Nucleic acid binder design. Sequence first.
RNA 1: GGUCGACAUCUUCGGAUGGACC
RNA 2: GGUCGACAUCUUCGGAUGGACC
Length: 108
Amino acid sequence: NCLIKIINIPQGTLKAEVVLAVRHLGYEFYCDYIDGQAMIRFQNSDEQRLAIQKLLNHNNNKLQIEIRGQICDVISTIPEDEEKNYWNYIKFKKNEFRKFFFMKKQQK
RNA sequence: GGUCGACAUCUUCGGAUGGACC
RNA sequence: GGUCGACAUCUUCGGAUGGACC
Ligand SMILES: [K+]
């Protein structure tokens, strides 16, 4: 619904280079960039659908995006286990963000 | 009138902070 | 009370913009 995954991102590529390429789609998203791959969560599922049709290359019928002059394939169908692990990853990060301020109050 | 390539608004990355907004 | 890893403050090198401040 809200997720796509960019793979085969060239080595040494900074996160900003990845984020910039996705910004060209004109939709708001969060980005996690690990191990030459990047997960992308759009704000709503509808804009993800519209993002897919922009990445879709009708010549080879596959989703692609250019990064540093190279062609990177994107996945629209995430394996169930990978997505499940991913939402838990977020939940921890979000709760970690809120735990920070809570503990700061305790320091008083 | 004086000051300003050393002034402001917005803003990418990076760094340092804690609470921020409604 | 609600929303914030998608909230903000400060800051180095930059970008855009025009006036900014006394
Ligand atoms: K993400």
